[PDB]
Design a protein around this nucleic acid. Structure first.
Ligand SMILES: [Mg+2]
Ligand SMILES: [Mg+2]
Ligand SMILES: [Mg+2]
Ligand SMILES: [Mg+2]
Ligand SMILES: [Mg+2]
Ligand SMILES: [Mg+2]
Ligand SMILES: [Mg+2]
Ligand SMILES: [Mg+2]
Ligand SMILES: [Mg+2]
Ligand SMILES: [Mg+2]
Ligand SMILES: [Mg+2]
Ligand SMILES: [Mg+2]
Ligand SMILES: [Mg+2]
Ligand SMILES: [Mg+2]
Ligand SMILES: [Mg+2]
Ligand SMILES: [Mg+2]
Ligand SMILES: [Mg+2]
Ligand SMILES: [Mg+2]
Ligand SMILES: [Mg+2]
Ligand SMILES: [Mg+2]
Ligand SMILES: [Mg+2]
Ligand SMILES: [Mg+2]
Ligand SMILES: [Mg+2]
Ligand SMILES: [Mg+2]
Ligand SMILES: [Mg+2]
Lengths: 51, 148, 193, 99
RNA sequence: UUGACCUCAAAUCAGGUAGGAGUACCCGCUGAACUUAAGCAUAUCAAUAAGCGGAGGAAAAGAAACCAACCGGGAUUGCCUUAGUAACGGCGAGUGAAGCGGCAAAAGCUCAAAUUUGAAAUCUGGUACCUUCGGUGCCCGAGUUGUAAUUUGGAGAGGGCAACUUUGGGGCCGUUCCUUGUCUAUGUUCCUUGGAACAGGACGUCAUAGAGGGUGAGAAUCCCGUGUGGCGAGGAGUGCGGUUCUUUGUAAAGUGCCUUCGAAGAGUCGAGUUGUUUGGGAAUGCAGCUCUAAGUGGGUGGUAAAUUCCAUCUAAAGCUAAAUAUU
RNA sequence: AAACCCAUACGCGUAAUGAAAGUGAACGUAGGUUGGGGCCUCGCAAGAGGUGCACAAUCGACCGAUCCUGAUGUCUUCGGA
RNA sequence: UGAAAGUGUGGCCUAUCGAUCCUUUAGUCCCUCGGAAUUUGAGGCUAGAGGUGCCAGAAAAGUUACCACAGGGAUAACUGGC
């Protein structure tokens, strides 16, 4: 009966997810994770729905 | 969590912040509320005046639904109308088209007169009201029709 | 043990509570089990909607009487008026409650219309043959949602007659309070000679 | 039992047109029946009275119905039961005077 | 004298049944103290541990002698809440539910009390046969001190009128479930190190398979497997999906109107007292003793009593899955 | 057992006060006085004046309880301005 | 009370006394008994009394040389020290 799971407010969850999505369209932050996108022309990287 | 706790910092120090003379002991003043009329009396009188004794009249089998009477002050009283039609009704300050506000369906049992609705007519359906609230409503030009 | 300015706490842990602590780790798995059970039941009653038609009914307790609610069963008079018997209805997906009684014509006729809608919306396969495949849904409650009745309109004229509606409540309260005294006084008046 | 339309008073509540449902047969449960009257009347003949009923007959003849009701409230439990039993005993007295 | 009945017995009589183990969870009985109260006696610990009896895969409870006071709800269980609240309490320490509301899950019913009386229509057993979780025939027997049909209060029954509507059981092949088997890709190519390559580097392949394990060191591609689908086997089964044979049935069930009726549980309810218990407070339940009912009656309506009303149920008999618990 | 989505309720809060029955928060630019950061105006500046959130002190007003007073009126004992 | 001014809310001043809970009385004759009423009864509001002298207020007799435990040099029975 230790506390194992934590409540996080729904809107804080959504704030964080939106921030993490916005950080995807920043080549400075993607390189800083070590993702090897130096030769990638530009991000957000969008490909066709044929995939 | 455990690493931001002063227990980690007391490591090396003998008493763990509890003293050498006082010697953290099990329950030196008692368990719980022991001593309220005794050695904890000053605290119970300084910070809990009224703790000891019984005052009034008992109620056997009290149901907290006979006493359900949530109060709405006049100052709001248009929050019960949606934003879509509120401006309409406020600029068309007219009888023959006055808005109806069932406060019970919104979840209120009594209307009170805290302050200053505008001079627009309004029909207010309420189980209970106050003297001043109804005075202000019919001075604005409305009417309180009671319901159950 | 009593100390600096803090609220008096009533924490009821002076019994052997650690022997009785249920931690609901089973929340997710038990949800999975409920979903699997609903699926199995639906497959077993593969055309049927997994829930009986329940009536619309008015809640007790003046706190809650402003709200209408789903009830248990359709009040034998209601189904008789709907034009079918209780035994047949129970085999057709209609909950019947023999112990509730109709005192309100609005609720009565609303539930009767509910039953007529259900009878028009269902198809009942014969006991003999075909079984004409019919695309079950899983809820009769979603197909017949409980709607709150519209008691009034959104705008009306102002009809003020000068009764003040606070003195009204006041006088109702006062006559309730002093009813018996006045009846006793009238009795003592009538028994004068 | 008609309501007024307001939230306090004698007949407080909302006005709704009523229906008067059919009478439940489980409201006439203690209702007497001819078979049952016959059976009980017959059994009272052959079984007769009990000691405390005999005592009630005597107290009603001599000391009146008030002490009879007191004694019957003690021997039985309740005042209303005592009243009913004393009335039964008065009927018995009249019938035995006729017989 | 003979033959019955009643009650009681004996049989290594014919057939069966109980015991003990386990006991996490479940139904009960019994029942502490340490401890807390800064002492201690009520209290608390706790209606707990220990002790005893008794079950199943769940048990129990359960179709209201309920909750309510509402425009009323409507078996039981469980969760969220109500609520650390109403209330109990050397009113101290402490204890402490319930109605409503939201949800999971949902399912309803059956006996007694009625003359079959123009037909004990009912049933165990034995025995012959058969298609054997049983059936048919025959024969003793049980049983009228009441076995079947009929009805269970939501109703319902006996007559009278009037028309309509609906039905049972076997086989076969599938599907559902259980268990199990089997088949279903791609490198062991080159160099270095090393005892060993599963390491490093080069070139490649498969991928709905780069989960995991093994193999002389970190292996998707060496092996088992994994993933995706396929092909079988054996059962249980009435859940349904089709096909086939029997026609159940001059039977049963349902519905409308009139009329006469409408049986409804007793050493129980209830009361007094004692003890225990409960939040239950002039007495919540339980038990013991004493007293002991009624039938337009009785219970309940959380302040004892009398009077007048109202509301709501229908006890003293009974069965029932699911949601729930599980060291 | 994650992550994502959601209805209706429920909890706290938006109203207190009285044992309770119960009543229930604007005389006023939501008050006045004193002081108050910051802003504005004049001033080269010094400073003067205006406005003055928060906060503090104080006098008032409003709601409830208590103690009074007790109008129009009336089931003549209710009502309570 | 005094002509009056004025004095007087116990004793010329400094001491002469007492919570909760319970009971009881007085007052308002007011509130509640929660399905609705009447009358009893009971419970509530406000002010006192019944008392705790260990006097901020447990309900309380001894012994142990048969003794026990936690401790104390905060504290005795030796030396020593002043
Ligand atoms: Mg410290
Ligand atoms: Mg230490
Ligand atoms: Mg200390
Ligand atoms: Mg010390
Ligand atoms: Mg102690
Ligand atoms: Mg101690
Ligand atoms: Mg002790
Ligand atoms: Mg045990
Ligand atoms: Mg069971
Ligand atoms: Mg049972
Ligand atoms: Mg709370
Ligand atoms: Mg307890
Ligand atoms: Mg007792
Ligand atoms: Mg016991
Ligand atoms: Mg008792
Ligand atoms: Mg001010
Ligand atoms: Mg004076
Ligand atoms: Mg003096
Ligand atoms: Mg005193
Ligand atoms: Mg008192
Ligand atoms: Mg002292
Ligand atoms: Mg001793
Ligand atoms: Mg000694
Ligand atoms: Mg001695
Ligand atoms: Mg010393």
């Amino acid at each position: 009966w230790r506390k194992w799971n934590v409540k996080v407010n729904h809107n804080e969850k959504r704030y964080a997810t939106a921030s993490a999505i916005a950080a995807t369209a920043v080549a400075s932050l993607v390189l800083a994770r070590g993702h090897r996108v130096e030769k990638i022309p530009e991000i957000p990287l969008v490909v066709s729905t044929d995939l | 969590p455990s690493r931001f706790t002063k227990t980690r910092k007391h490591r090396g120090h003998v008493s763990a912040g509890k003293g050498r003379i006082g010697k953290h002991r099990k329950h030196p003043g008692g368990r719980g509320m022991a001593g309220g009329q005794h050695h904890h009396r000053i605290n119970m009188d300084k910070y809990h005046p009224g703790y000891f004794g019984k005052v009034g009249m008992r109620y056997f089998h009290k149901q907290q639904a006979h006493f359900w009477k949530p109060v709405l002050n006049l100052d709001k009283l248009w929050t019960l109308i949606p934003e879509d039609k509120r401006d309409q009704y406020l600029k068309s300050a007219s009888k023959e088209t006055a808005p109806v506000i069932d406060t019970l369906a919104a979840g209120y049992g009594k209307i009170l007169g805290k302050g200053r609705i505008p001079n627009v007519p309004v029909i207010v359906k309420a189980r209970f009201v106050s003297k001043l609230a109804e005075e202000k409503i019919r001075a604005a030009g409305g009417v309180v029709e009671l319901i159950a | 043990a009593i100390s600096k300015n803090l609220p008096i706490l009533k924490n009821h842990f002076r019994k052997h509570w650690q022997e009785r602590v249920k931690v609901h780790f089973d929340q997710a798995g038990k949800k999975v089990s409920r979903r699997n059970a609903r699926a199995t039941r639906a497959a077993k009653i593969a055309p049927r909607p997994l829930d009986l038609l329940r009536p619309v009914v008015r809640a007790p307790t003046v706190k809650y009487n402003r709200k209408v609610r789903a009830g248990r069963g359709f009040t034998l008079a209601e189904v008789k008026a709907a034009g079918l018997t209780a035994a047949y209805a129970r085999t057709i997906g209609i909950a019947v409650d023999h112990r509730r009684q109709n005192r309100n014509q609005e609720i009565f006729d609303a539930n009767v219309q509910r039953l007529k809608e259900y009878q028009s919306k269902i198809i009942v396969f014969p006991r003999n043959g075909k079984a004409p495949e019919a695309e079950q849904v899983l809820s009769a409650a979603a197909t017949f949602p409980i709607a709150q009745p519209a008691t009034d309109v959104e705008a009306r004229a102002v009809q003020d007659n000068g009764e003040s509606a606070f003195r009204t409540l006041r006088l109702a309260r006062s006559e309730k309070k002093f009813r018996g005294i006045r009846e006793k006084r009238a009795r003592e008046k009538a028994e004068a000679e | 039992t008609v309501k007024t339309g307001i939230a306090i008073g004698l007949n407080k509540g909302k006005k709704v047109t009523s229906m008067t449902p059919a009478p439940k047969i489980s409201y006439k449960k203690g209702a007497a029946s001819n078979r049952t009257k016959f059976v009980r009347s017959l059994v009272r003949e052959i079984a007769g009275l009990s000691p405390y009923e005999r005592r009630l007959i005597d107290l009603i003849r001599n000391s009146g119905e008030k002490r009879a009701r007191k004694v019957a409230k003690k021997r039985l439990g309740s005042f209303t039961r005592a009243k009913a039993k004393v009335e039964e005993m008065n009927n018995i007295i009249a019938a035995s005077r006729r017989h």
